[model samples]
Target: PMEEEEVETFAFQAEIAQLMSLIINTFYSNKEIFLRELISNSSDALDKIRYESLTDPSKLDSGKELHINLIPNKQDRTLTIVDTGIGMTKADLINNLGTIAKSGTKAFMEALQAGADISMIGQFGVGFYSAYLVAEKVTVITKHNDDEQYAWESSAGGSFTVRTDTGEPMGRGTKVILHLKEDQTEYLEERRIKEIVKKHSQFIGYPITLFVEK
Candidate 1:
């Protein structure tokens, strides 16, 4: 029996809090580019784990396929991208996802050296916040090889939440779920998803599939 998924709250660094609001709202002309930015992130995660496997095959997740799954449910209005890649721990969740932190410089430099496809994103820590342009709320459910499953959520304004995941486990991977805003509901389409993945993520070294109804 998995125990309770305890919840914790965090306020962004004073400056981070302010800049995120300004960045997301002010100058982004192409909202659909958010998917490009996000899918790029998934590919990077997969590459990181692959690099580890080169030195020690034991670091790889058993039976995990290297792919990305895009599932859009119009009924509930959610678009989710699930990746079989290295996931984040609690501290990593907070440091990378919770705030617009300054650590992205070192992180991006290292990521480039990891040989992840860098069509040049992740330079600033808040590109993840692009989800806010379409989502009412964004939830990240992930499981790292070294830690239990956890969820990190944010509204794209000010504060965020982190919690252990009490349900099924995802081994060495990440799930980014977006609750679509009313006007952006068109994102819940299979053709649209495939188009965006092709436009921005075609060079990604993993399979990007738009999951369809059975």
Candidate 2:
């Protein structure tokens, strides 16, 4: 039987609000970079799990292959990026997603407003925020070896919610579901997803599979 869990809501750090505004409106001229950013983030997580498993083989207890899956739900209007990678603990979700760039957020925000060649902004940790470019709400479900599965949800407005996930056991890793925008439905097409992956993340280290239905 599934146990009941508590739900908690968190306000976005000041910088996160300002940063999301810039990201959705002014960050990149090409919105497709969202996929690249997300995939690269997944790759980073996978690398972490692999490295940690080197010292403690038990880290691989999930027994799942390390890879990324891009599932586009046309009827539900959602695009999910699932990765069998180093998942996040509840605290990790709060710290990583609640805050933006620690102390560097101010500098990055200033640079973006000044239009001072914003190439280095990616280093400031706005890659996750890029989801706002195409999504109205983003839901992140992750499980860490040391922690129970948790769900973090945000609409990129000013606050988000986190709670223990009572859904099916994911076994391991992270699942990011982007509740896509109406105009962004083009991303739901298999052909478009394939092209984007081939164009941007074709040579990534892990296998990226897109679900196709018969």
Candidate 3:
């Protein structure tokens, strides 16, 4: 005799899914443009870390410098973007990547339905999802101030998985590895990455460095 297991299914709110698809498809024309997005994200992260360190000097150690590193590996066809910023914990990855309406989109809608003030940074949760627009897969290794280093990985369909890193010690920061697509090989060039960083993030508050192949 055999027993049947129960199956469950879920659907995204129609309006949310529609908005997500539209934004993902139309916001940026070329997938290579993700460099700008990644750099901007790094800048934002540094801002937070510095702000926090203002109250707690220990947060920024003696040798810890706030910067972003762009590493392109041509042989592996991968682009690794690293930032010495406020890294995330296991809970943060779950909340930030696993939940929709994390930007208060659902609450905003509810307010609108109730005839209350509905002003908000609507869709404030879209930036993280942008990684999928260019990467076939993404691996995020992060270490928070008070927690052990952990890794978050996904293909960005609708779900993600998080696990603790048992390998080498990943210091306080976040490193994102993008598995480039076939047509996105241009991103693995050093000059191309430098050009993109200068174009979009030249005036960013933090120093941006590119690790090129010699």
Candidate whose TM-score is highest: 2
In the range 26-87, model 3's lDDT, one tens digit per residue, is: 43454454666677777888888888978988866647889998888988988899998988
Candidate 2: misplaced stretches above 4 Å?
A: 1-3, 25-28, 60-62, 114-121
Q: Measured by C-alpha RMSD in angstroms, how accurate is candidate 3? A: 7.9
For model 2, give the 10-residue run with minimal summed lDDT. Answer: 116-125
lDDT of 1 at 84: 88
List candidate 3 segments past 4 Å from native.
Answer: 1-28, 100-125
Better of 1 and 2 by TM-score: 2
Q: lDDT score of model 1?
A: 0.77
For residues 163-188, write the lDDT of model 2, one tens digit per residue.
99988888679999999988899999
Q: Which pairs, if any, clash in model 3?
A: none
The all-Cα superposition gives candidate 2 an RMSD in Å to the true structure of 2.3
- Residue 213 displacement in candidate 3 (angstroms): 1.3
Q: How well is each residue in 1-214 modelled by candidate 1, as lDDT tens digits? A: 6466689999987655664565445434467777887788899899988897887888754787898888999889999989988899888998877554565544544554565433333455546766776787889999997898999988866899999888777777999999998888778887887777777677888988887765
Worst 10 residues of 1 by lDDT: 115-124
Q: Is candidate 1 or candidate 2 better by lDDT?
A: 2
